[PDB]
Amino acid sequence: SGKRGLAWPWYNSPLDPGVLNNGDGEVVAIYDWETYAPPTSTGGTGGLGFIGMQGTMDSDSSPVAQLATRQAQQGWATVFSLNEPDINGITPAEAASWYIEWVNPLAIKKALPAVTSSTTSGQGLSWLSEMISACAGACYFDYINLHWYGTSFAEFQAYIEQAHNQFPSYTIVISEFALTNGGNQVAFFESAFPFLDGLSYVLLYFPFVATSPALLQANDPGAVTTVGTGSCLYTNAGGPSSVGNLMY
Numbered sequence: 070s071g072k073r074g075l076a077w078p079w080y081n082s083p084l085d086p087g088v089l090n091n092g093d094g095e096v097v098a099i100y101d102w103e104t105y106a107p108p109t110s111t112g113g114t115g116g117l118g119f120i121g122m123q124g125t126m127d128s129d130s131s132p133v134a135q136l137a138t139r140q141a142q143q144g145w146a147t148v149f150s151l152n153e154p155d156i157n158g159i160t161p162a163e164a165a166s167w168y169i170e171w172v173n174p175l176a177i178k179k180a181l182p183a184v185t186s187s188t189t190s191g192q193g194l195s196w197l198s199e200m201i202s203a204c205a206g207a208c209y210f211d212y213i214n215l216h217w218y219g220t221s222f223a224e225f226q227a228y229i230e231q232a233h234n235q236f237p238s239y240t241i242v243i244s245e246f247a248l249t250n251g252g253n254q255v256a257f258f259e260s261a262f263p264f265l266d267g268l269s270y271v272l273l274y275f276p277f278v279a280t281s282p283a284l285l286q287a288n289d290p291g292a293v294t295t296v297g298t299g300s301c302l303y304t305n306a307g308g309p310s311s312v313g314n315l316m317y
């Protein structure tokens with residue numbers, strides 16, 4: 070049907086995911102970096118499939134002891150694992166043993182931890198390569214999960230092609246991508262959507278970020294500094310932004 074998803078933050082109570090779901094089927098998924106249902110203005114997900122995410126090894130709001138319980142209650146078809154462990158002081162071996170213990174048991178589609186686009190040893194795809202070696206085939210997974218932030222569509226295209234060249238038998242989900250602050254976000258996503266839509270090895274992609282600029286600044290001011298406000302899919306009024314209009 071389509072590959073587009075909403076990267077839906079915890080602070081999004083005021084907003085309606087259904088605004089970006091016009092029935093044509095391009096937008097199919099939503100995740101909220103947690104294992105509880107997306108906070109929304111309707112209480113529901115606007116007809117999108119929620120993907121559970123165990124983004125840290127354990128937290129108050131997503132206790133890992135409740136991960137199997139939540140998947141069973143909510144009936145997710147897919148689950149995401151750790152968010153950027155490659156820059157959060159989690160070794161590939163630690164992630165492999167944690168994944169085997171906690172994520173393996175969910176008999177659904179599963180993604181390995183979202184890694185950053187760093188080229189440094191022990192980060193990014195180097196980290197992911199070490200985690201797959203530490204797994205030694207004992208991790209069950211369907212997808213590798215990528216983040217990308219950078220300065221041009223050309224650089225993004227080169228990064229996705231690099232990932233595929235290095236992992237050619239693997240399926241990719243992109244859980245966060247945008248330009249860093251300054252660039253034309255509309256031009257970037259106008260280029261990125263048709264590029265990713267044509268790649269049979271990319272199953273899902275989620276622009277950072279399905280919120281409004283006012284909510285981004287009020288709750289994630291660090292992200293405004295890094296990325297700016299141009300990649301927000303919503304206007305402050307809670308309709309589609311210029312980038313949101315590209316989701317339909």
Ligand SMILES: OC[C@H]1O[C@@H](O[C@@H]2[C@@H](O)[C@H](O)O[C@H](CO)[C@H]2O)[C@H](O)[C@@H](O)[C@@H]1O
Binds near residue numbers: 176178
């Ligand atoms: O993610 C890979 C595949 O995992 C499957 O669940 C696994 C069971 O089939 C397997 O025998 O048990 C393991 C370890 O408990 C489960 O992860 C999913 O059912 C598949 O959908 C998925 O493609």
Ligand SMILES: [Cl-]
Binds near residue numbers: 216218
């Ligand atoms: Cl990145």
